[PDB]
Ligand binder design. Structure first.
Ligand SMILES: *[C@@H]1O[C@H](CO)[C@@H](O[C@@H]2O[C@H](CO)[C@@H](O[C@@H]3O[C@H](CO[C@H]4O[C@H](CO)[C@@H](O)[C@H](O)[C@@H]4O)[C@@H](O)[C@H](O[C@H]4O[C@H](CO)[C@@H](O)[C@H](O)[C@@H]4O)[C@@H]3O)[C@H](O)[C@H]2NC(C)=O)[C@H](O)[C@H]1NC(C)=O
Ligand SMILES: *[C@@H]1O[C@H](CO)[C@@H](O[C@@H]2O[C@H](CO)[C@@H](O[C@@H]3O[C@H](CO)[C@@H](O)[C@H](O)[C@@H]3O)[C@H](O)[C@H]2NC(C)=O)[C@H](O)[C@H]1NC(C)=O
Ligand SMILES: *[C@@H]1O[C@H](CO)[C@@H](O[C@@H]2O[C@H](CO)[C@@H](O[C@@H]3O[C@H](CO)[C@@H](O)[C@H](O)[C@@H]3O)[C@H](O)[C@H]2NC(C)=O)[C@H](O)[C@H]1NC(C)=O
Ligand SMILES: *[C@@H]1O[C@H](CO)[C@@H](O[C@@H]2O[C@H](CO)[C@@H](O)[C@H](O)[C@H]2NC(C)=O)[C@H](O)[C@H]1NC(C)=O
Ligand SMILES: *[C@@H]1O[C@H](CO)[C@@H](O[C@@H]2O[C@H](CO)[C@@H](O)[C@H](O)[C@H]2NC(C)=O)[C@H](O)[C@H]1NC(C)=O
Ligand SMILES: *[C@@H]1O[C@H](CO)[C@@H](O[C@@H]2O[C@H](CO)[C@@H](O)[C@H](O)[C@H]2NC(C)=O)[C@H](O)[C@H]1NC(C)=O
Ligand SMILES: *[C@@H]1O[C@H](CO)[C@@H](O[C@@H]2O[C@H](CO)[C@@H](O)[C@H](O)[C@H]2NC(C)=O)[C@H](O)[C@H]1NC(C)=O
Ligand SMILES: *[C@@H]1O[C@H](CO)[C@@H](O[C@@H]2O[C@H](CO)[C@@H](O)[C@H](O)[C@H]2NC(C)=O)[C@H](O)[C@H]1NC(C)=O
Ligand code: NAG
Ligand code: NAG
Ligand code: NAG
Ligand code: NAG
Ligand code: NAG
Ligand code: NAG
Ligand code: NAG
Ligand code: NAG
Ligand code: NAG
Ligand code: NAG
Ligand code: NAG
Ligand code: NAG
Ligand code: NAG
Ligand code: NAG
Ligand code: NAG
Ligand code: NAG
Ligand code: NAG
Ligand code: NAG
Ligand code: NAG
Ligand code: NAG
Lengths: 124, 453, 124, 124, 53
């Protein structure tokens, strides 16, 4: 059954992780100027992270992997209970003072090395 | 293999110039004090704490002022800013009615033996079938007669309408930054000496420049951004007298300007709902408005500028200064704003010197008006109400404008005098090192190797 | 060290070619109408060439190769010194009266043939 | 020869199918507000189906295949004459009361299963 | 078609004030012929015979 928009946000990971399409299917769904300010704002937030996803070697892939390993000074919780006993609202506040180190180290790890090796493996 | 194929790159720095629109952004505190209302800097997308600046390397560029599109963009919006701040506050047509009067009595008992004109007329009340008698004051620079007590009129009721100033809005300038949208860049080069045009060795880019305070002044730039360690001259076509002369300096000099007579006000009602303010009565002595200046420093910077100015006019020639020529008053005097009023100072006590190639205070007189035909426009005019209290303002003199004369060839020891009467060049004085440009990310070049299918 | 925005534009190719991410990270970073004219202009220039990149078989790949060879009537400089002794400002003015022949011949060379052969190799 | 914009729309499939680039090359090519309402409308229609294409596992690929088979209750015409004796204007009215079943069944068929198997085949 | 106005004018301008320059009809000098229009006769017959067919 289709649970709907923002459905299992109180649930755990594996329930919420399997249904991710509907967040995109609702994402872009005198009194003329204030309406027009909304549509230019809505197109701005969508188009911003889109290329910020696209710079990370993931163009339209909703779920994708990468190359950089995990520095264990970030978290210490090993594998199982983080997929089984927390929520994303619990997760995102917990790792908040890391993301600026994450995003910059993410992008150059693939899309400097993995294109230069691509320019050297497709070379010969 | 030894044939070469092509590849495509994205986002490589090249630029070719263009022009687009801009926007403005400046606040740190000024919306919180605000005096409840200010001339319209209201939302303006408040600025960033730490601006960005990247030094560049191995790059030259041609630079030309006098053709920047940005100065007309600062010209057009302030005009649209000024009237929009002035329009929805209250109109007055019915003031310019006939009137008769003579001067005030201790006008002849002062240093200022001039013009006060204690005056009176009939004015409509809140009710349409009632008139009323008033008594007020007006300077001779705001009244003129028709050609018995010879009846008078306001200066240009014969040309256009008059609208009074809105009582709570301030006129004091707030620094403003001007910032370019995405896909664009602004270039400034940071050389110390910069003689107007030409190439510049060391450049840099910033999204948006330092603050500019849009002061409205003639013949003397005040609260302007200061130069570097050495005085400079700027022009178009020296030894062709049509344009003007701009000079910037390094040592700022003080100026103090006051208005002694605090001369309390009254207010009646035109009605319905037109609270008109007018000039009340004066108590105390009368001293006309004036300004002081440090004497020896003014000698020092004038001796400083004439050593720099000589290089563009030979070695053994003589330079003489003179006062303004004439015509309208607005090119002759030094006009400016202070505290919401407009002074007109004669400045003849400065440019009175010759120069041979080998603790005192100058008191200059000043006069005030109450009707302004600002921005050289004909078709509207504004009325400013007087303000109680004693006003007093200090500023830095930074940048004078100059104009040559006629004469003959390079033998007869040419002279100078101030003037100008325009406002665009004052913004050209402080936007000299900026230009817009557009990036272009797309590029293509041949590589060595091939592509997997 | 991060050289910054428009950093090595006076440098040579191989220095400038290795750092290309920061040009994208800065690319989308009464007085309401003139601000609003800027944001609709900024979104227009970005979205224009984006699909013009996307039509060329390169969706989010910052650096990508292709199929069409080089017609040697375009340039004659062989390989080495063009990567070693010129700038992009020197380069782009030099090849200016070619690009309309380039772009049209580029797009049909892949994305007509390389999809039709894709529709024939994934066929059988 | 280049037939041009909306060229072979009266022709058959195989003539029209081989030339599809020019529909994209023309797709984004007081009186200030009504102009500005047009450009925000034009960017809205383009950006809408773009991600709706991108959710279907086809990011920038103009022609792409998928996984779901054909339910034969939809049409009965077998292969040949539909590529040889109809137009797209004839086609699209004929299959109109199907598309809502099509689009939803399309997207979860790849981009739920084909990413989860991707998360299990790249697992081991 | 040709259409003219023979009796041109001279005009005056009075000020309503403040700043309302009103314009109005001055005086006329010369003859008086009212406004009219000429038209080619036989062509007008020809197109009217054309349209009725
Ligand atoms: C060039 O640059 C100079 C340097 O800043 C400017 O000169 C200043 O101009 C401002 C604008 O008028 C002056 O501000 C005025 O200050 C007077 C003194 O106020 C002091 O004391 C009060 C307490 O009584 C404090 O609250 C205040 O912060 C000051 O410390 C005031 O009398 C004036 O008050 C008016 O405005 C306020 C608020 O709107 C009202 O409450 C008053 O009733 C009155 O309406 C005014 O605030 C300032 O003193 C000037 N000097 C300096 C050193 O800053 C020039 O204006 C500028 N431009 C030009 C063209 O020269
Ligand atoms: C001064 O104004 C002009 C316009 O920008 C520039 O210089 C002047 O141009 C005129 C017109 O070309 C010159 O006249 C010339 O005279 C010779 C006679 O020898 C004649 O053969 C030419 O055909 C032409 O008519 C004039 O000499 C020249 N200079 C001046 C001083 O008027 C110049 O850009 C401006 N600035 C300066 C500093 O001159
Ligand atoms: C439209 O048709 C009328 C005819 O109905 C034309 O009017 C004719 O105009 C000419 C030119 O002005 C007149 O001739 C003039 O006569 C005087 C007499 O002294 C002479 O001095 C002038 O030099 C000139 O020859 C003519 O009398 C007049 N006829 C009539 C019946 O009005 C008219 O010109 C046509 N065109 C337009 C644009 O009106
Ligand atoms: C409107 O009033 C002004 C008052 O300034 C008139 O200007 C005067 O014009 C006469 C014409 O010779 C001069 O002699 C006076 O010297 C001018 N006055 C001043 C104070 O200089 C002006 O003519 C009037 N009319 C218009 C249409 O502006
Ligand atoms: C601005 O200053 C520069 C710096 O000196 C001047 O450039 C050179 O000046 C010397 C002075 O003898 C000349 O010999 C050179 O020919 C100048 N270099 C050029 C023109 O490339 C420059 O002339 C000054 N320009 C102005 C307008 O004052
Ligand atoms: C500007 O200079 C004048 C001097 O001309 C100063 O005026 C003096 O002020 C004091 C203060 O009461 C008087 O005792 C003197 O008699 C004044 N001198 C004259 C000649 O009138 C004035 O104070 C200076 N400063 C300002 C801000 O105006
Ligand atoms: C500025 O002050 C000077 C100094 O008096 C004024 O110059 C006078 O002008 C009149 C009229 O031309 C002459 O008769 C006087 O001889 C001049 N005085 C001197 C000392 O030469 C000048 O008019 C003033 N300017 C303004 C705009 O008021
Ligand atoms: C109709 O137009 C004619 C144009 O010639 C006007 O006549 C001229 O008016 C000027 C005014 O300065 C005189 O100098 C000429 O001598 C006139 N030319 C003539 C009379 O042939 C004529 O005034 C206009 N009609 C009216 C009614 O004003
Ligand atoms: C709600 O929380 C309880 C807590 O264990 C859980 O068992 C249950 O499955 C959750 N239900 C939904 C619909 O999220
Ligand atoms: C993890 O980050 C710290 C800095 O907080 C660094 O000192 C350490 O070397 C990093 N470890 C790894 C494995 O990257
Ligand atoms: C880590 O492994 C231990 C094994 O003893 C387990 O008890 C614990 O729950 C695990 N932690 C997480 C976050 O899964
Ligand atoms: C964590 O984030 C909060 C957010 O306000 C910040 O104030 C705090 O300093 C951060 N702690 C760090 C960076 O150690
Ligand atoms: C600038 O030019 C010099 C001169 O060849 C060169 O050696 C240097 O690498 C260039 N680039 C810099 C300083 O980034
Ligand atoms: C005001 O109106 C009265 C009404 O008659 C008249 O007597 C008087 O002279 C007028 N005064 C002025 C200054 O117009
Ligand atoms: C001038 O200022 C004094 C300061 O106390 C004030 O009392 C007086 O009313 C003011 N006005 C005059 C003298 O007209
Ligand atoms: C101007 O007034 C200020 C006020 O503090 C004073 O310090 C300065 O000396 C004065 N300058 C002159 C030239 O009077
Ligand atoms: C300025 O000072 C110099 C001395 O450096 C002196 O010769 C000259 O007369 C002075 N001029 C004025 C106007 O004070
Ligand atoms: C004029 O005097 C200055 C002052 O030393 C000198 O540098 C310059 O060379 C002189 N001009 C000429 C043409 O010699
Ligand atoms: C101008 O200079 C002359 C000569 O020094 C002097 O007599 C005259 O008083 C001066 N005028 C002014 C207004 O300073
Ligand atoms: C005037 O110049 C002095 C010199 O440093 C400076 O401190 C002061 O801030 C300047 N005045 C203004 C209003 O900027
Ligand atoms: C290169 O282009 C020219 C047209 O300028 C053409 O005649 C020639 O055949 C082309 N060569 C190749 C190898 O494509
Ligand atoms: C082409 O190869 C020759 C080999 O002699 C070399 O000298 C030249 O620099 C090369 N040209 C370029 C553009 O690299
Ligand atoms: C090269 O480009 C310029 C750009 O204006 C153009 O004028 C010129 O004709 C072009 N040359 C060709 C196409 O041969
Ligand atoms: C085709 O669709 C019908 C519903 O209209 C359904 O009953 C049938 O099972 C479907 N067949 C296949 C093979 O999916
Ligand atoms: C289906 O196959 C038959 C074979 O007899 C053929 O006649 C018919 O045209 C085909 N239908 C289509 C739609 O191609
Ligand atoms: C087919 O589509 C039309 C469109 O209006 C609709 O009215 C009709 O009911 C549909 N038929 C179905 C769903 O069987
Ligand atoms: C109308 O006037 C024009 C003016 O050149 C003339 O050629 C034409 O013959 C006239 N037509 C008639 C019908 O008078
Ligand atoms: C129009 O011309 C026809 C000749 O073709 C003639 O018979 C008829 O009477 C004319 N009518 C008029 C109104 O001139």
């Amino acid at each position: 059954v289709s649970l709907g928009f923002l459905g299992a946000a109180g649930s755990t990971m594996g329930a919420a992780s399997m249904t991710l399409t509907v967040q995109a299917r609702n994402l872009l769904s005198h009194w003329g100027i204030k309406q027009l300010q909304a549509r230019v704002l809505a197109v701005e937030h969508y188009l911003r992270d889109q290329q910020l996803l696209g710079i990370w070697g993931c163009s339209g892939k909703l779920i994708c992997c990468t190359n950089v390993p995990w520095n264990s000074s970030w978290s210490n919780r090993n594998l199982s209970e983080i997929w089984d006993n927390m929520t994303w609202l619990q997760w995102d506040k917990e790792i908040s003072n890391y993301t600026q180190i994450i995003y910059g180290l993410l992008e150059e790890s693939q899309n400097q090395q993995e294109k230069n090796e691509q320019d050297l493996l497709a070379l010969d | 293999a030894e044939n070469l194929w092509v590849t495509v790159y994205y986002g490589v720095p090249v630029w070719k110039d263009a022009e687009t629109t801009l926007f403005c952004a400046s606040d740190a505190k000024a919306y919180e004090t605000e005096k409840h209302n200010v001339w319209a800097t209201h939302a303006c997308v408040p600025t960033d704490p730490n601006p960005q600046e990247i030094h560049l390397e191995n790059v030259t560029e041609e630079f030309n002022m006098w053709k920047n599109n940005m100065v007309e963009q600062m010209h057009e919006d302030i005009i649209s800013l000024w009237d929009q701040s002035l329009k929805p506050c209250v109109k007055l047509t019915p003031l310019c009615v006939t009137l008769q009067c003579t001067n005030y009595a201790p006008n002849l008992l002062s240093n200022m033996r001039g013009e006060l004109k204690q005056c009176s007329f009939n004015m409509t009340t809140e009710l349409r079938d009632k008139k009323q008698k008033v008594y007020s004051l007006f300077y001779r620079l705001d009244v003129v007669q028709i050609n018995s007590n010879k009846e008078y009129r306001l200066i240009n009721c014969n040309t256009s309408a008059i609208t009074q100033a809105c009582p709570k809005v301030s006129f004091e300038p707030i620094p403003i930054h001007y910032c370019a949208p995405a896909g664009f860049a602004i270039l400034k080069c940071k050389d110390k000496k910069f003689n107007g045009t030409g190439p510049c060795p060391s450049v840099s880019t910033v999204q948006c420049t330092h603050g500019i305070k849009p002061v409205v002044s003639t013949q003397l730039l005040l609260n302007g951004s200061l130069a570097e360690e050495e005085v400079i001259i700027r022009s178009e076509n020296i030894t062709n007298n049509a344009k003007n002369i701009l000079v910037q300096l390094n040592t700022p000099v003080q100026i103090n300007c006051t208005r002694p007579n605090n001369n309390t006000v009254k207010s009646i009602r035109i009605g319905p709902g037109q609270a008109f303010y007018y000039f009340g009565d004066i108590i105390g002595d009368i001293r006309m408005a004036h300004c002081n200046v440090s004497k020896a420093t003014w000698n020092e910077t004038l001796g400083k500028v004439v050593k720099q100015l000589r290089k563009h006019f030979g070695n053994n020639t003589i330079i003489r200064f003179a006062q303004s020529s004439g015509g309208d008053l607005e090119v002759t005097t030094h006009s400016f704003n202070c505290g919401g009023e407009f002074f007109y100072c004669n400045t003849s006590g400065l440019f009175n010197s010759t120069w041979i190639s080998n603790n005192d205070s100058i008191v200059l007189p000043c006069r005030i008006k109450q009707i302004i035909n600002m921005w050289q426009r004909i078709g509207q005019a504004m009325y400013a109400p007087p303000i109680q209290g004693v006003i007093r303002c200090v500023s830095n003199i930074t940048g004078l404008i100059l104009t040559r004369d006629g004469g003959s060839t390079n033998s007869t020891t040419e002279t100078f005098r101030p003037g100008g009467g325009d406002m665009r060049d004052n913004w050209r004085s402080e936007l000299y090192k900026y230009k817009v440009v557009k990036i272009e990310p797309l590029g293509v070049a041949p590589t060595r190797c091939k592509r997997r299918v």
